[PDB]
């Protein structure tokens, strides 16, 4: 009987391809296959995901070229990834992470082929500039439900699964399909790579910002500072006096003096200080 602690370690490559494909495919419930591997009874390793040329209808999608897929499989065996199918994924742009009826049927087929297949869902609409809305799934056996058996033995505390979503519950979560825990593992190369991605070049690292633009920038910032000081003086002219405590934040829903003052003073700190430092450092380092 399957275990609760089952994990799916998805390669960063796989995640990026999934998300890019789905974001391209919005709103179409675009679909793709992935090659991974079943290392053991507690883990599934997902390596790569490649899409499907099919472009069906604005409510549904369909497999077009089994020949396409078989050829991709053979060739990737030749070079690329000698993995072989472990599941499939499709975007649900703005629905959560639940499986429609057709989704469940496709799965049923996948499991019939390989009892431990996996389905995957991604929400490029919802996946934020930060956390990413994704999940994995495997069906629930109606035979087990009728017999009273249970999906997985939870020989762990890895069954919290971060508060299964109400939407997934509604659409059928844990009554026909159950979530699984995703993870990201890096063999240090992609890891330090990821680190490199944002890192910028010493070109700029030493490139002092032009100084005429900087002088004008300071001029503008000091002007807006003067005005913010005026309105701040007016605001403090009463502040607690005349007791806006009941007014609280609702004293005015606009134009807080202090917050703007601190924001702009901080930014002009940054600008002026670092530019002066770069000036000093260059003057002295190029000799």
């Amino acid at each position: 009987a399957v275990d609760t602690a089952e994990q799916v370690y998805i390669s960063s490559l796989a995640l990026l391809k999934m998300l890019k494909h789905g974001r391209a495919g919005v709103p179409m419930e675009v679909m793709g296959l992935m090659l991974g591997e079943f290392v053991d009874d507690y883990t599934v390793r997902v390596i790569d995901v490649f899409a499907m040329p099919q472009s069906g209808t604005g409510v549904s999608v369909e497999a077009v070229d089994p020949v396409f897929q078989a050829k991709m499989l053979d060739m990737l065996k030749q070079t690329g990834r000698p993995e072989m199918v472990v599941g499939w994924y499709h975007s649900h742009p703005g629905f959560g992470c639940w499986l429609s009826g057709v989704d469940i049927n496709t799965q049923q087929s996948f499991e019939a082929l390989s009892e431990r297949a996996v389905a995957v869902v991604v929400d490029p609409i919802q996946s934020v500039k930060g956390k990413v809305v994704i999940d994995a799934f495997r069906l629930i056996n109606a035979n087990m439900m009728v017999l009273g058996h249970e999906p997985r033995q939870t020989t762990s505390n890895l069954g919290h699964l971060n508060k299964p979503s109400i939407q997934a519950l509604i659409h059928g979560l844990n009554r026909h399909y159950y979530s699984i825990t995703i993870n990201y593992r890096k063999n240090e190369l992609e890891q330090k790579m990821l680190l490199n991605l944002h890192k910028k070049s010493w070109m700029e690292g030493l490139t002092l910002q032009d100084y005429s633009e900087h002088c004008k920038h300071n001029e503008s910032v000091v002007k807006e500072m003067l005005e913010l000081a005026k309105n701040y003086n007016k605001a403090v002219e009463e502040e607690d006096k005349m007791t806006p405590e009941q007014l609280a934040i609702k004293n005015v829903g606009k134009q807080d003096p202090k917050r703007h003052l601190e924001e702009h003073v901080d930014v002009l700190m940054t600008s002026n200080i670092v530019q002066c430092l770069a000036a000093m450092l260059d003057t002295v380092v190029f000799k």
Binding site: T57, G58, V59, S60
Partner: peptide
Amino acid sequence: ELREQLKELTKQYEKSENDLKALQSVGQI
């Protein structure tokens, strides 16, 4: 009448399949 019956059946198949495909395309707003 083999060829004629086959042709008529094929025409029916074509129209029926096209109608089913047509039935599966919701509208927009």
